[PDB]
């Protein structure tokens, strides 16, 4: 399966959602999650990330590894979203800043 990692957090551009083919995003209040057992694993999201935020499961950073779980824990309580929708606002003062898992909201 692929991973949303830190960047997405206050950034959620939503540009992953257009090209997933199995519709497996699931949305957060200012964060985005992928459903382990749906995803196909096509990588088609990837290059679609302005955060370059999502990486499959064996390449998410060393220092990231949470968000694997997390990912499977969201996924299941998150609503599904399937329509691209417009960024957080501020998304780009928040694209690059690090360890915004600390800013994550439920
Ligand atoms: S790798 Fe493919 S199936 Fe998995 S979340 Fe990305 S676009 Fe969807
Ligand atoms: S910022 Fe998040 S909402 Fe999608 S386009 Fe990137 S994983």
Not at 26 to 49: K, Q
Request: charge should be negative; include cysteine.
């Amino acid at each position: 399966a692929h991973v949303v990692t830190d960047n997405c957090i206050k950034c959620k551009y939503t540009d992953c959602v257009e090209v997933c083919p199995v519709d497996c995003f699931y949305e957060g209040p200012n964060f985005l999650v992928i459903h382990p057992d749906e995803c196909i694993d096509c990588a088609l999201c990837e290059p679609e990330c302005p955060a370059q935020a999502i990486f499959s499961e064996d390449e998410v950073p060393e220092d990231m590894q949470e968000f694997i779980q997390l990912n499977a824990e969201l996924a299941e309580v998150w609503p599904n979203i399937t329509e691209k929708k417009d960024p957080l606002p501020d998304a780009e003062d928040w694209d690059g800043v690090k360890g915004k898992l600390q800013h994550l909201e439920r």
